């Protein structure tokens, strides 16, 4: 279940290079024959913590003062 | 017994698709094998997934020998 979904949500789910490195190091740390070490179990937790961390999903930002004014006027 | 019905038997699509269900690995990769209509690429995909699992378990027995020499 999660062993196959978390294997493939490392490299197509967009993720920064500081975080893609640990996602790949837990791709290599896990998937080791269903590793049963306690660090592998908390890494099974941690890889789920480190893939649904939201990246490659920015939403459009505005660098003008005029649109900055009126949205907080609506707020 | 599964090899006796495929060795010396025609229809290599039979021979690929019958054993692509029987062995247990990632189900989505089995469905992708069903998606792959190229027969030679299907046989090579089965061989490559077999090679991936074989090198996984050769690394298993290598690290197991590391653990054995480590406990010695």
UniProtKB/TrEMBL annotation, chain B:
Cellular compartment(s): Cytoplasm
Induction conditions: By heat shock.
Domain of life of the organism encoding this protein: Bacteria
Role: ATP-dependent serine protease that mediates the selective degradation of mutant and abnormal proteins as well as certain short-lived regulatory proteins. Required for cellular homeostasis and for survival from DNA damage and developmental changes induced by stress. Degrades polypeptides processively to yield small peptide fragments that are 5 to 10 amino acids long. Binds to DNA in a double-stranded, site-specific manner.
Subunit structure: Homohexamer. Organized in a ring with a central cavity.
Family statement drawn from the similarity comment of this UniProt entry: Belongs to the peptidase S16 family.
Name of the protein in its database record: Lon protease
The organism of origin for this protein: Meiothermus taiwanensis
Residues of the full protein shown: 147 to 218 of 793
